[PDB]
């Protein structure tokens, strides 16, 4: 129940960016809704905090907690290109 309110605001915002003919904004707001929903599953399934992280920070945290299958899947779902994922992994793991 805790994210229904935040999800409703984002919906109201998607609708707004569509009336406004701002296609990029609408889609981005759709992606953020999808990501917040995923973030709540992850708190539910693994505990700890994931709400409100950026996508990159979510993947990074997952890698760091040992959840490498979920992290890869998460990157594929948002079509993160190979080069950007490689850099992400490398900065996650380095001293």
């Amino acid at each position: 129940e805790r994210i229904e309110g935040r999800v409703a605001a984002l919906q109201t915002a998607a609708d707004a960016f569509y009336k406004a003919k701002n296609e990029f904004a609408a889609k981005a707001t759709e992606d953020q809704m999808r990501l917040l929903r995923l973030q709540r599953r992850l708190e539910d399934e693994l505990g700890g905090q994931f709400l409100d992280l950026s996508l990159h920070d979510t993947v990074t945290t997952l890698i760091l907690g040992g959840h490498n299958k979920r992290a890869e899947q998460l990157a594929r779902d948002f079509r993160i290109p190979d080069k950007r994922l490689w850099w992400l992994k490398l900065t996650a793991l380095a001293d």
């Binding site: 953020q32 996508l55 950007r84 490689w86 850099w87």
Partner: protein, 574 residues
């Protein structure tokens, strides 16, 4: 302050007038005082008056404005120094109504800065405390002198307010600022401008002068010209990395109210940052601040040898005669040694940054875009920085530079940059991207049309192989890039704006001219509406000191900034 008088206009007249006003105000509030400060005001007020002056007017305590009860203090008077903001009126009311009634009371007063507001007073009346103030006045601190040729309002929000929010409050204060200058330094007979904001400032100047009805101004004009310039006429310059000594101190550590906070390891005695004042009162800083950073090393070596030799000369003073003299020179020798040690340590800090691989790569990219190369493809260094999650603002400066040099980016490119910025830094920054678009900094290209090359080639804005050591052109400050703003100023003075009509017509806003009637090297006052960088300032000092019969510049601005603080101010409180 001697340095306020080193140039053409004596800015102590101005500083001393506003100090006199403050004194007169404190003297009406007789007896011991505490000042309660709207925190936003303390920094810039520091250029006008430190605690040492206030102390001589029996200010015994200084507090910050917050809610609930005021702190206990055995003083006769509490004085609020505060901006005319509605929300702050509620806090003051709470302070006043929470006084312990029993025992001797404390008289209340209020000084509104920079203006008193009928509306704020109405609010204080409704809250039930207007009648508790014995004095209510305004102190119209608009243009603050930072150096002998430099004035700022230090209004960081002006750019946003004007170009995104349609709020021209800051233009009214600029006009009022210009009226105060004309009361002290005489009427400015010629006014030139380029930009929407400029047109409004001019229109308000002229109105305010027609509506004045005091003694006619007899003062012989010190300024020959005013040039009003919209920041949005030259969006490029602030984005680029500054390459002067003062520029780089600002890029890297930030200069606030003419002080910088540095890491302390290299300084005496070595816990907290080393705080230093940077202005023209220090001979050595006057000499290197406007230089390209690659010319500074030689200057420092020369001084090291001179100072070193003076001190080495103490072994030779064996006599009673020449010990008298060496001794008389010592204070100056010690201060020159100290000044040199500081700037020598600052140069080493800047060198650690400017020799890094990341700096070299950033600059290669900046220079690629400014000279017209590949300003429409997704750029691989930007993509590496985004992937490594470098500082968001570094990334934004770079993509905005690309947009401005290309007259926008094709949809696909712009959208690709945006998606990867939101994925990496967070959806919440979509607001920052929209603001950048409305500012004209990161936007879609329209048609296939791209005008920067015509503007660049015509105004000679990029040059290769520039002299950095003995400069011959304003491009030295960015090692090749001539700031557009300064180039326009230069070309107004000689040969005149008729020669570039076709280019002005593709830059934002009108270009215009007005005269102000007078009773029966030129000095130009140049006013940046929306901010100015230290590199632009250096370039203007560079024109000022050519003894080619041109013009000398005194610089005013709404704000002293760089690309980083400019863009931070376009973001929202996350």
């Amino acid at each position: 302050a001697a340095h306020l008088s080193y140039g053409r206009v004596n800015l102590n007249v101005l500083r001393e007038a506003v100090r006199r006003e403050l004194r007169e105000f404190l003297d009406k509030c007789a007896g011991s005082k505490a000042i309660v400060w709207d925190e936003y005001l303390t920094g810039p007020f520091g250029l006008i008056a430190q605690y040492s002056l206030l102390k001589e007017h029996e200010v015994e305590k200084m507090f910050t404005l917050k809610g609930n009860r005021l702190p206990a203090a055995d003083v006769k008077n509490i004085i609020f120094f505060v901006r005319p903001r509605l929300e702050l009126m509620d806090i003051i009311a709470e302070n006043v109504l929470s006084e312990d009634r029993r025992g001797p009371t404390r008289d209340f007063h209020i000084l509104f800065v920079p203006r008193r507001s009928l509306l704020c007073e109405q609010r204080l009346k409704d809250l039930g405390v207007l009648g508790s103030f014995i004095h209510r006045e305004e102190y119209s601190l608009d243009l603050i002198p930072f150096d002998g040729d430099l004035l700022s309002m230090e209004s960081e929000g002006a750019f946003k307010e004007c170009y995104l929010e349609g709020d021209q409050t800051s233009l009214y204060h600029a006009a009022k600022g210009l009226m105060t200058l004309q009361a002290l330094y005489g009427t400015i007979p010629q006014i030139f401008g380029k930009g929407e904001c400029a047109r409004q400032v001019a229109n308000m100047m002229i109105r305010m002068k027609r509506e004045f009805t005091g003694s006619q101004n007899s003062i012989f004009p010190v300024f020959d010209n005013l040039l009003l310039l919209d920041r949005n006429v030259d969006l490029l310059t602030p984005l680029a990395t500054q390459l002067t000594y003062e520029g780089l101190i600002d890029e890297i550590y930030g200069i606030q109210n003419s002080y910088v906070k540095l890491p302390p390891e290299k300084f005496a005695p070595k816990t907290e940052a080393k705080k230093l004042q940077l202005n023209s009162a220090e001979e050595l800083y006057a000499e290197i601040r406007d230089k390209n950073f690659n010319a500074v090393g030689s200057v420092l070596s020369k001084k090291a040898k001179i100072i070193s030799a003076a001190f080495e000369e103490r072994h030779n003073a064996k006599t009673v005669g020449e010990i008298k003299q060496f001794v008389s020179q010592l204070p100056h020798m010690q201060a020159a040694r100290g000044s040199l040690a500081n700037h020598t340590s600052i140069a080493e800090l800047i060198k650690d940054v400017t020799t890094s691989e990341d700096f070299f790569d950033k600059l290669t990219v900046e220079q690629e875009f400014m000279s017209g190369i590949d300003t429409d493809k997704v750029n691989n260094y930007i993509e590496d920085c985004i992937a490594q999650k470098h500082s968001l603002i570094k990334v934004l400066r770079l993509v905005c530079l690309q947009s401005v040099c290309n007259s926008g980016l094709k949809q696909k490119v712009l959208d690709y940059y945006k998606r990867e910025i939101l994925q990496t830094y967070g959806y919440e920054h979509i607001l920052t991207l929209h603001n950048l678009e409305k500012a004209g900094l990161l936007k879609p290209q329209t048609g296939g049309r791209n005008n920067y090359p015509t503007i660049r080639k015509t105004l000679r804005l990029w040059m290769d192989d520039v002299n950095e050591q003995n400069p011959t052109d304003i491009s030295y400050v960015y090692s090749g890039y001539a700031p557009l703003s300064v180039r326009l100023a230069q070309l107004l003075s000689r040969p005149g704006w008729r020669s570039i009509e076709e280019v002005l017509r593709i830059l934002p806003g009108p270009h215009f001219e007005e005269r102000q009637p007078l009773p029966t090297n030129r000095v130009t006052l140049i006013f940046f509406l929306g901010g100015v960088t230290f590199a632009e300032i250096a370039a203007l000092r560079f024109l000022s000191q050519l003894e080619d019969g041109g013009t000398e510049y005194v610089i005013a601005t709404t704000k002293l900034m760089n690309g980083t603080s400019w863009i931070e101010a376009l973001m929202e409180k996350p």
